[PDB]
Specification:
Chain A: It is found in: Endoplasmic reticulum; Endoplasmic reticulum lumen; Melanosome; Cell membrane. 2 copies of one chain form a homodimer. Chain A is α/β, with parallel strands linked by helices. Chain A has helices at residues 8-16, 32-42, 55-60, 87-97, 110-114, 133-145, 164-169, 189-196; strands spanning 3-4, 20-25, 49-52, 67-72, 78-80, 102-104, 120-125, 151-156, 179-185.
């Protein structure tokens, strides 16, 4: 499920092996919380998992108690798990922190956007051929900074043929871009409508 | 702007010519109300407009006084405009009555969905191959009754290849359907931040 890490070099190697990586720091690998972590490791194959009981490895990442850390090669670089160690809490934590601050809508990216726990999403339809593209995108990223865990910032490449149906869905023509659409995501459907309202 | 209708025959032709048609019934073609109507007619590209002064056409459609009727080939079939004949009142009237209770997401339909003043949308992902298709669609209509004017009910064909990107947008796979999603539409680096602070 998770690769055992006996030393600092193995921890580092594992962190470098992927865009996103996760280490469980559990003194007792046979403990209930540790099992819960190992169960979380098996439930996801997109990300590699590590596990240490080595207190030098604990200290290398400034852990002085059991814990789990998500490592990422972008943005804030890492997130520390908070609260009770259960499989469901861990999968929630991994999903809420797996994504880049500004996320490019792609095929691999789409299911993880839905996987987030953020209701409000801001879409920027940004043509990759636009003037000052990287400046306009950084502006979106800068604005994304002061909304961490409140609004999910998504950018869509308007020039790409596969995004045209999404442009249509939000009533957009390619020449109306860059454009911004802010959205909130959510006969037993009558009950579904009330809870959403 | 709007085609003149001298007789009952031209009127029916016009009504039959589209999914949604609108007729303005005005004795005097250049009265204030008739003028407002023609301006509303110029502001909507999607539907054809007729104008009549002939009292036979009035009675045909059971108008004794001047007025505006929207005709449609679905749901209740017609809606009568009730209020002062303003351009803004008419455009409001059309947009509120223009669309089916349960609208199929298509290419022609797409711009009219996003433009709607309802903003809170429920999407049924209904594969056209699903067993008991109209029975499943029937329940969607029954629920659509409870939320008319509050939630815009939309269905989409999950089977169709040109809908794949919308499925992905809503984290859905072909097999995971039928399925339902609700969505609410709302609205420089500093301009974005100020726009985003629409929490309060």
């Amino acid at each position: 499920a998770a690769t055992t890490l006996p030393d600092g070099a193995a921890a580092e190697s594992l962190v470098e092996s992927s865009e996103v990586a996760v280490i469980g720091f559990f003194k007792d690998v046979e403990s209930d919380s540790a099992k819960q972590f190992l169960q979380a490791a098996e439930a996801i194959d997109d990300i590699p998992f590590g596990i240490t009981s080595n207190s030098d490895v604990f200290s290398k990442y400034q852990l002085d108690k059991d814990g789990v850390v998500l490592f990422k090669k972008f943005d804030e670089g890492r997130n520390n798990f908070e609260g009770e160690v259960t499989k469901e809490n861990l999968l929630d934590f991994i999903k809420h922190n797996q994504l880049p601050l500004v996320i490019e809508f792609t095929e691999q990216t789409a299911p993880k956007i839905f996987g987030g726990e953020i209701k409000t999403h801001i879409l920027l339809f940004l043509p990759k051929s636009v003037s000052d593209y990287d400046g306009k995108l950084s502006n979106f990223k800068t604005a994304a900074e002061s909304f961490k865990g409140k609004i999910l910032f998504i950018f869509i490449d308007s020039d790409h043929t596969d995004n045209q149906r999404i442009l249509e869905f939000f009533g957009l023509k390619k020449e109306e871009c860059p454009a911004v659409r802010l959205i909130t995501l959510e006969e037993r459907i009558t009950e579904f409508c009330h809870r959403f309202l």
